[PDB]
Amino acid sequence: EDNSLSQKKKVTVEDLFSEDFKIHDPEAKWISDTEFIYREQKGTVRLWNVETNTSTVLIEGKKIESLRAIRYEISPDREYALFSYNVEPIYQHSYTGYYVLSKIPHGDPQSLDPPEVSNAKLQYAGWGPKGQQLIFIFENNIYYCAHVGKQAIRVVSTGKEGVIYNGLSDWLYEEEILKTHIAHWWSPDGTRLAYAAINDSRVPIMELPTYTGSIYPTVKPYHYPKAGSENPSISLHVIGLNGPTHDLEMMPPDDPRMREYYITMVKWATSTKVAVTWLNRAQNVSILTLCDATTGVCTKKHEDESEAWLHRQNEEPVFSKDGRKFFFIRAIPQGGRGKFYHITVSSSQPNSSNDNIQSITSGDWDVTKILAYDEKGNKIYFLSTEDLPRRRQLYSANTVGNFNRQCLSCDLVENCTYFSASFSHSMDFFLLKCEGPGVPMVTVHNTTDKKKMFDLETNEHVKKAINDRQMPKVEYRDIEIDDYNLPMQILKPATFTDTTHYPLLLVVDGTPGSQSVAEKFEVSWETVMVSSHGAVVVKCDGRGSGFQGTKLLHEVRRRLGLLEEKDQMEAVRTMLKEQYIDRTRVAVFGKDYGGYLSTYILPAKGENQGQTFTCGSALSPITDFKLYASAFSERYLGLHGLDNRAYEMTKVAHRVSALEEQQFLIIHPTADEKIHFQHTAELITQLIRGKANYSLQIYPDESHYFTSSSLKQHLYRSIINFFVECFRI
Amino acid sequence: EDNSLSQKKKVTVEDLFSEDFKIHDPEAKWISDTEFIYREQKGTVRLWNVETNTSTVLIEGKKIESLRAIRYEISPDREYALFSYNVEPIYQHSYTGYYVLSKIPHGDPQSLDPPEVSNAKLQYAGWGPKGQQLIFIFENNIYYCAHVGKQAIRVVSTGKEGVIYNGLSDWLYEEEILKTHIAHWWSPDGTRLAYAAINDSRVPIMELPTYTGSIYPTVKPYHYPKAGSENPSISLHVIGLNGPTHDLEMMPPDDPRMREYYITMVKWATSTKVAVTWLNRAQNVSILTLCDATTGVCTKKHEDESEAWLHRQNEEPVFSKDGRKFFFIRAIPQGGRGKFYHITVSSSQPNSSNDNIQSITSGDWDVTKILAYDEKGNKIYFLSTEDLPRRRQLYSANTVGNFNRQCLSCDLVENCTYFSASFSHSMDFFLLKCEGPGVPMVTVHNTTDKKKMFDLETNEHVKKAINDRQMPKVEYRDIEIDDYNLPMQILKPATFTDTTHYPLLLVVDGTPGSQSVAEKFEVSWETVMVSSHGAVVVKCDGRGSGFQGTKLLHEVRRRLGLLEEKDQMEAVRTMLKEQYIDRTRVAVFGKDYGGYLSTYILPAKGENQGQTFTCGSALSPITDFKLYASAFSERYLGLHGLDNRAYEMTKVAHRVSALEEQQFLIIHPTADEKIHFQHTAELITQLIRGKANYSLQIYPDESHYFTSSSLKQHLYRSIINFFVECFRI
């Protein structure tokens, strides 16, 4: 007999925004092989020279005075830096606002401004590879300044506001393919810049309604392609930083299946050579091409094509110091059960006669990314799910014929399993972060000794908070269906008892090409609810989850809805067969694409066990893929315009007809830029036709990602305050 | 052993939309001294005479096969019939559609057409007063045809789509002040037409979002002058039906405080002289003016003004056949409690030295509208509130010094005790209709014998249905605060039991010049919920409502909402003393302006007696009157643009701040043009900042007047479903 009270306060709503839980990552980047940038720890920014415990104050409590410049970065000369803050701060991935130049010693603000124009907003500044040369993007125009005090030079200015995007990515590139906003890349020599110019005039335009703006609010118009519409028309240009600065346009290939090209990847192969990944409009035919920036001569080095589509076309080709044989990562057949994503080798100049396909790694697992390759001998470092899909571990292999894989850390202090590392220019030291399943562990390590030769950032306060609050028990119960094994992640409220029945939630994302069951450390509304309300949560990554086989990924190609619905529902079936789960209170949640799923999965099982969930909800739930971005629609459903009959069954209406007793809900901001309000509007219309019971909460004229702490706090509060009633008996 | 069965079934929403409760009112109109239209009640169109039960079917039941024309009007010569079908209403009265002309007996339907154009949608056609002459308004252009066989001829075409209106009303001149879409007047002889030209060029424009139209739904722009904006430029023009049809325009007076004006009332004095009412922008000066058509010159007749505002702007004076003294209705002091609305005599040509004002009526009551004046006698027939403000009865005063208002209707029927009458050209024969609280009756009568020859429509189905189900018993309970009187209405399902407790739902409308506590028979969601769900619903006409004193109207100048809030909370506190009613379950409802009330009456009384309303709700509420039409904001809260500071204290936002835990609902269609959705969006923003629980529903791209049955039943089902789980414990 024992009691074991363990009376510690349950996690409240504010805990996610409590400074104790305010996880800090310096996000160090190797300035050289002997030191890293060592950004803000708790204020001043030092330069912790990794050689021998030496820290030099490069930045001090001075950016606090400069109107709280959110972002900061120092030029390669380490002598003049740029600070940047925001006025009317919009950054979902936008990152606009004010830029300022400043001095390395201290103080000295300097408004980096467009020529002939005073202090004004700037899109992006960045740094060059050499000395203090910088650029800045004003109203879709790239201007360059080799010297900090040098008068601005209009390198290119033909870009137009919302019409021509050169030096920055438009919304489709900012959200669907590049997933990054910067569309310029410096050459290795710091003399040339390769950028992308996008014409958007032919692109169809939508207008987001506005209410809260003014007494006569007007719609914000911008281009937003859809299925069967006109995609942005991109071109690739190269312009020098000095002298003539000639613009050179690179010719894409003219294959019969190469109708329209997406620039999924472009990188300087050398100071004059460049490697570009060009994908067909159907997103099922990719071509890796090697071109010459100063010459413009293009020649293909590889080509791949898949029946369904190509995944992770954002490959990063890591090159040698002189354009010698380099590395790549791609899907090799790997026999049965999916052409797994493994590493591959390319020679310096692969002849058109044959390819250099050389799987450095082989096995039923995938490499998430290639970390780095260093030329003294044979060392490729990378992150992979080799040990387990739900974990990202560090691995190293050798480029010489031995091809021997090797772990580096394989667990460290306080239960760390998840890994993510980053090497320097010359292997001298590499950073490593845990971010799971414990507190993130910012650390330095040395390639030879492989030892933590000083603690970088541990966040002991986070451990104190996690031991001072009822952090819910983490559990795993891998499931298996048909010809695949599906991960899972059930949670228990740390006061659980097998005798006491407890309610259940299913959290679903199911994004095609991503994963939800990961050992990354995270605290969100689910953690609070399992703490504040004590309901188990289920995270099942059904068919189409990433890093689990290309065949599994393509299982849902043009077959959305049903398969993932089957997986999530069968996860619910598996959870109900226990004695600690009461059928009275079982709920679901979703968001973004998962919102779709969060709506698609409310049918009746059998006849006695109908109305599978008492309550459900969604957030920004995509419902019609015709009304969503073309780069996404055509990817998983093919090109429109020819009536492919791949959209009628995709509409969630077909499933929402029943809605017998489920207490549904929708939360959707008015001014959503990713998933338009039209999706919620159509769903509500269909619901009205079906005459169902639901409630709606709205955010008037707000962005999609909730980049305001008040917005996120209110959102999590609303979700909790919604599940409380339907989980109360 | 067998007692068989008893008891009658209660009332459910399905009953409302069953055919049983439909009030098939024919709405007959006195064509001549001894005949009325006797329009459709259960099919065919039949003409009747008062002499001896004369039956004359003019049109068969062919409207069903005539594409189910929504409306029809016979030609004034009783020779042609105009059918209106395929109507797509946009406002309350903008029934744009298709018009087809046909011969009186039957056969040969002919589609009215614009010149040189085939069948197309028509804004309005109408009929003339004599012969077969007609007009029609197409794309804001008035064309006329004296001869039906004669094709369309151009008459006036200055109109522009949404900018220039000829003979019709814009939104402001349809819904706020003129309260109808009729802006054209036929001369008694059918020789000239008087039409209003509305210029919207300087009127600001607002877009209403569309969320359902197509792949890229676009906003709808229309001219909605907000508070502190420029009202449309209205001019009056008289045109001839023959010859050159040279236009002549009316010249308004030029008092220094009436430059910006509304033509709030204009009625033909004769076939060439007219009386027109100009109400200035501050609506504090209303000049009645006599104009001659052939010269275009307007001669001033009289002026009216008040310490707060003018009222009853569309009471058309009745001009005698000789143009002698017309008996208009103006605010005479009538002792205390403000200047009651009593009849004023005005001679044909009153001397400028002194007018011929004469208070025909008198008493602690007023006249709602004046039917006619028997030129062959000292009899003037009208409808007035002589008995009670909540009942209207027919009366006949003496235009000469007799001044005897006779007891004609005056409770001549046992049940309704509430009346509405309409006389002929000779006023010998008149139609009478009860319209509550009993089942409405339509009856013929003569003013000589005051005898009921036969009932025109008895609503037999309505009577049997009102006897079928357990009706809610009607009750009344006057209240008084200070020197103000306020009626009240309350219902019970008539199967009330004192032991069982029932909750209270408070319904408010509260708009100036209205009467929520009325003895009108009606079937709605209120009685359905009272019957089936067992609740008692209270209506209390607070301060600011009309028909009970010009002072009791005008005291709310710039203080619109607070006084009626005090009246309603007094009603709550003085009604919750019942031993069969409880403080736990108290709920409120609101609509349009009442939504503000439904939100403005939820504080926490003191500190202990909080939780005033358990589950409140509202429809299209208004919180910031700046975002609303100037003709309502300025008219009661003071003119906008001057920062009256009533536009910063009449916001319920600071009032809805507390709302600590009370659940609340909002319902608002997307395409609302009564109270723009911006009000709801701002309210939601405040609530998110206020951090209070709320719910919401949406109707995408739906007008405010609920022009469909399915939408109406969905709304009623949704509101009753909201209330049913918010009452039961």
Author numbering:
A (entry chain I), B (entry chain J): 59 to 787
Show passages lifted from the paper.
Modulation of voltage-gated potassium (Kv) channels by auxiliary subunits is central to the physiological function of channels in the brain and heart. Native Kv4 tetrameric channels form macromolecular ternary complexes with two auxiliary β-subunits—intracellular Kv channel-interacting proteins (KChIPs) and transmembrane dipeptidyl peptidase-related proteins (DPPs)—to evoke rapidly activating and inactivating A-type currents, which prevent the backpropagation of action potentials. Here we report cryo-electron microscopy structures of the Kv4.2–DPP6S–KChIP1 dodecamer complex, the Kv4.2–KChIP1 and Kv4.2–DPP6S octamer complexes, and Kv4.2 alone.
The 3D classes that contained four DPP6S molecules were selected for further 3D refinement with C2 symmetry imposed, because two DPP6S dimers were integrated with C2 symmetry in the complexes. Owing to the flexible position of the large extracellular domains of DPP6S floating above Kv4.2, the overall resolutions are 4.2 Å and 4.5 Å for the Kv4.2–DPP6S and Kv4.2–DPP6S–KChIP1 complexes, respectively. The dimeric crystal structure of the DPP6S extracellular domain43 was used as a guide to construct the atomic models of the Kv4.2–DPP6S and Kv4.2–DPP6S–KChIP1 structures. In the extracellular region, two DPP6S dimers float above the channel core.
